[PDB]
Amino acid sequence: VNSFSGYLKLTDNVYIKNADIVEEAKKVKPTVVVNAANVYLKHGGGVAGALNKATNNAMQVESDDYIATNGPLKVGGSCVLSGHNLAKHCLHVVGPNVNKGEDIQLLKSAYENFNQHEVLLAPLLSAGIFGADPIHSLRVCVDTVRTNVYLAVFDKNLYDKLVSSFL
Ligand SMILES: O=C1CCCN1Nc1ncnc2[nH]c3cc(F)ccc3c12
Numbered sequence: 001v002n003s004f005s006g007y008l009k010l011t012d013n014v015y016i017k018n019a020d021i022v023e024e025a026k027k028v029k030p031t032v033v034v035n036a037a038n039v040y041l042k043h044g045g046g047v048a049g050a051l052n053k054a055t056n057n058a059m060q061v062e063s064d065d066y067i068a069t070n071g072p073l074k075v076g077g078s079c080v081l082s083g084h085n086l087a088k089h090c091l092h093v094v095g096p097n098v099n100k101g102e103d104i105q106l107l108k109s110a111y112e113n114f115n116q117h118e119v120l121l122a123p124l125l126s127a128g129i130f131g132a133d134p135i136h137s138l139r140v141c142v143d144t145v146r147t148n149v150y151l152a153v154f155d156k157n158l159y160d161k162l163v164s165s166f167l
Pocket of ligand 1: 019020022045046049050123126127129135152
């Protein structure tokens with residue numbers, strides 16, 4: 001038993017809710033919140049900008065030190081950093097950004113990072129400003145992630161579409 005509330009159960013291990021991931025994280029304090037990161041951990045907009053804003057820019061300060069030490073992430077890769085006031089940890093995962101011409105097949109690799117964590121609160125990778133089809137992203141999630149994932153979808157219209165079309 002865990003504290004996630006109001007989710008629709010899609011599969012054995014995948015759950016979905018129309019919610020603002022920032023508000024959900026603040027209320028749940030999950031062990032892991034996933035960020036929709038880029039390879040430079042520049043959290044300027046989308047989910048990343050919202051999560052970073054909710055940390056009062058502490059996520060960005062920590063991220064800049066991470067990059068200065070380690071260099072950029074790989075597309076499809078991830079790193080674990082602090083969850084600040086939102087979660088114990090933030091798993092920064094880089095899905096491919098279609099608006100940069102990145103290969104979509106990397107989306108499966110991106111989701112594989114979730115399997116290193118027993119339970120996660122997450123957005124749909126490569127959705128939103130990353131330009132992928134969220135219905136495809138949901139399919140890859142269900143077919144790749146084996147750990148327990150609670151997906152927060154900000155847009156109510158999109159949430160209803162994802163549910164209604166789910167196979
Ligand atoms: O809806 C979708 C589907 C693909 C990613 N994505 N974006 C979010 N998904 C969940 N929670 C979110 N909170 C936000 C706050 C913002 F300012 C901007 C975007 C989001 C967001």
